[PDB]
Design a protein around this nucleic acid. Structure first.
Lengths: 192, 257, 50, 50
RNA sequence: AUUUUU
C-alpha cells in the first residue's frame, strides 16, 4: 500500500543521493502520463538539435572573422546553462550574404591565434556568394570536457571571405549541436 | 497494542463503509524518515561517531572508480605509493689520492639518510611516522679510467659495528655484507640489506639500523697522466618500507625504553 | 500565461513554544514538476539570463 | 618506562545549551587493556599498596 | 553510441 512518505510527509535532509523519482499520491489522484506528440521535446538531442541565432558580422574587406563560440543565455539554448560540462558534435549554420564571392569557414578549439592564420586543416568549407551551409564541427578539443559557461565554451569560428570587386556584405551566424553530452547539472541562472 | 494502529483502523473502516464509488478515505501509518539511529564511520586511524545522521547524498549517476580511462597520466596507478621506495642518491664524496688502506672514504646515516633533505621522495611520509622497518638495496658506484687501479671496501655496518668500530680488526670486515670491488674491473657494487637491529622497529630519523661505509682496501695507483679526481657515489633503494607509529610533523618520538 | 492557481498557507494552530524555544520560525517553499511533467513547444525568450 | 603517548581531547563544536540546560558538563576518562593484552615478566615493586 | 530512424 501507500506509505505516509509518498503522501507528502517527508524530510528535506534525507533527499541525497540526487535524483529521487518518488511518487506522490492522495485519494482520487495518480501520476498520469499522457503524450500529445509521437516524441519528446525534452530530450537533449531533440531540443538542442534545433539551431538558434548567435551573432552577425558585417564585412567590407577580405579580413578574417574570429569569434569565441559560447552557449546562449538568450534562446531555448539557455537550457544548457543548467549544466556544467559539455562534449560532442557542434552544428554551425552560416549565411553568406554577398553579391559575388566566396566564404571560407573553419572551426577549432585551439586557443592559439596563430594556428588559424593559415586555415590549412581547420575545415575551410566554401559557401558561394548568396549561399548558406551547415557544417558539423567534431569535438577536436584538447580538453575532455567543455565548461558550458566559458566565453569560449565552444571552439572558435573562422570566416575569411574571398571577395572579387568592391562588393561587401554581412555574415549572419546561428548554431545548434548534434548529440550533446551534458554533465553535473548546476543551479538555475539569474535574470538581468 | 495501540499508538500505530492509525492506518488499519481508518483504512479498514472506510473499506467497510464504501459504496460503488469506493472508499472516501485512506490512512497509512509508518516510521518517520528521521529515525532514532546511530552512524559510525572509520577512515585511516580515525572513527567518527554521529548519533544524529542524515541520508548521505551524491551527484547524478556518479562514477567513483576515480580512474582516468584515458590515462592522461601514463604512469602506474600505484606510482605515488611506491615513490618513496624509489632509488636515490645518498652520497657522493671524492676519493682523495694518497689515502692509506683502512681509511674511511665516506659513510651514510642509515636509515635517516633517505630523508636526508626535503627533496627526498621518502622525506614526505617519513615525517608523519616515528617507527620504521625496511630493507635496503645499495649501489655504490666508482668510476676510474683503465690506466688507473685500486680497490675499495663497500660494507654495511649495523649499529653494533658502528658503535664498536675501533674495537674491530679491519681486514675482517669481509665478514659483513660487503663488496671488495677492484677498480678498473667493476664500476658499481650491489648490496641487498634486510632490516637488521636488536629491536623490532627503529626510530625514524635515527642513525640506528647501522650505516653503510666505503673504505680504502688498497690506495689508488694513479699513473702520471691519468686523472686524479675519483668520485665515490652511494645510491639507495628501499626493497620494502614500513612506517607505523603516527606522530606530529617531524617530532622526535622515543619508540625505545 | 494563466496562473497555476492561488497558493495560501493559513494558520490552523498557533505555533506553541517554551522558555528556551523560539516564538516564531522560518519557512521555505520549493517547487518542482511531477513525474508526469512534460514540456512541448520551444518558443522565443521572454527574458535574458546571466 | 616510556609513556603510552600523548592524550588530547580538543573542542570541535562548542557545547550548546538552553534556558533550562547546563552551560558546562562533567567528563570521565577510563582505561583498560585490549582483548589482546598480555603481561610477561613479574618484577619487583615500585610502590606499596594499602 | 539504436549518442540519425525502427
Amino acid at each position: 500500500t501507500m506509505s505516509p512518505n509518498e503522501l507528502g510527509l517527508t524530510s528535506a535532509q534525507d533527499d541525497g543521493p540526487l535524483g529521487q523519482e518518488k511518487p506522490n499520491y492522495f485519494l482520487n489522484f495518480r501520476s498520469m502520463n499522457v503524450d500529445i506528440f509521437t516524441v519528446s521535446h525534452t530530450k537533449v538531442d531533440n531540443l538542442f538539435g534545433r539551431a538558434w541565432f548567435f551573432m552577425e558580422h558585417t564585412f567590407t574587406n577580405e579580413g578574417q572573422w574570429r569569434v569565441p563560440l559560447e552557449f546562449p543565455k538568450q534562446g531555448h539554448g539557455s537550457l544548457s546553462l543548467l549544466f556544467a560540462y559539455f562534449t560532442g558534435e557542434l552544428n554551425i549554420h552560416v549565411l553568406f550574404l554577398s553579391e559575388r564571392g566566396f566564404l571560407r569557414v573553419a572551426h577549432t578549439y585551439d586557443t592559439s591565434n596563430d594556428r588559424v592564420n593559415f586555415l590549412s586543416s581547420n575545415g575551410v568549407i566554401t559557401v558561394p556568394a548568396g549561399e548558406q551551409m551547415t557544417l558539423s564541427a567534431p569535438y577536436y578539443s584538447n580538453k575532455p570536457l567543455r565548461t558550458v559557461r566559458d566565453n569560449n565554451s565552444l571552439g572558435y569560428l573562422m570566416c575569411k571571405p574571398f571577395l572579387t570587386g568592391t562588393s561587401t556584405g554581412k555574415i549572419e551566424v546561428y548554431l545548434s549541436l548534434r548529440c550533446p553530452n551534458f554533465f553535473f547539472p548546476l543551479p538555475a541562472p539569474k535574470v538581468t | 497494542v495501540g499508538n500505530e494502529i492509525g492506518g488499519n483502523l481508518l483504512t479498514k473502516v472506510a473499506d467497510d463503509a464504501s459504496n460503488i464509488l469506493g472508499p472516501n478515505c485512506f490512512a497509512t501509518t509508518a516510521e518517520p524518515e528521521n529515525k532514532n539511529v546511530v552512524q559510525a564511520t572509520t577512515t585511516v586511524n580515525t572513527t567518527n561517531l554521529t548519533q544524529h545522521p542524515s541520508a548521505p547524498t551524491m551527484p547524478f549517476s556518479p562514477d567513483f572508480s576515480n580512474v582516468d580511462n584515458f590515462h592522461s597520466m601514463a604512469y602506474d596507478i600505484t606510482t605515488g605509493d611506491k615513490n618513496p621506495s624509489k632509488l636515490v642518491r645518498l652520497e657522493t664524496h671524492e676519493w682523495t689520492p694518497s689515502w692509506a688502506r683502512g681509511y674511511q672514504i665516506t659513510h651514510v646515516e642509515l636509515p635517516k639518510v633517505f630523508w636526508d633533505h626535503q627533496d627526498k621522495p621518502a622525506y614526505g611520509q617519513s615525517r608523519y611516522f616515528a617507527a620504521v622497518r625496511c630493507g635496503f638495496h645499495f649501489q655504490v658506484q666508482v668510476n676510474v679510467n683503465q690506466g688507473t687501479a685500486g680497490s675499495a671496501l663497500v660494507v654495511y655496518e649495523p649499529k653494533p659495528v658502528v658503535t664498536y668500530d675501533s674495537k674491530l680488526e679491519f681486514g675482517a670486515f669481509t665478514n659483513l655484507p660487503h663488496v671488495l670491488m677492484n677498480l678498473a674491473e667493476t664500476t658499481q657494487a650491489d648490496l641487498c640489506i634486510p632490516y637488521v637491529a636488536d629491536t623490532n622497529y627503529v626510530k625514524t630519523d635515527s642513525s640506528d639500523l647501522g650505516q653503510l661505509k666505503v673504505y680504502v682496501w688498497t690506495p689508488l695507483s694513479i699513473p702520471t697522466g691519468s686523472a686524479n679526481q675519483v668520485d665515490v657515489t652511494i645510491l639507495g633503494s628501499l626493497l620494502q618500507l614500513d612506517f607505523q607509529n603516527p606522530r606530529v610533523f617531524a617530532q622526535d618520538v622515543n619508540i625505545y625504553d | 500565461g494563466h496562473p497555476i492557481g492561488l497558493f495560501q498557507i493559513e494558520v490552523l494552530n498557533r505555533l506553541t513554544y517554551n522558555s528556551s524555544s523560539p516564538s516564531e520560525v522560518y519557512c521555505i517553499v520549493q517547487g518542482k514538476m511531477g513525474q508526469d511533467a512534460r514540456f512541448f513547444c520551444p518558443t522565443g525568450s521572454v527574458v535574458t539570463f546571466q
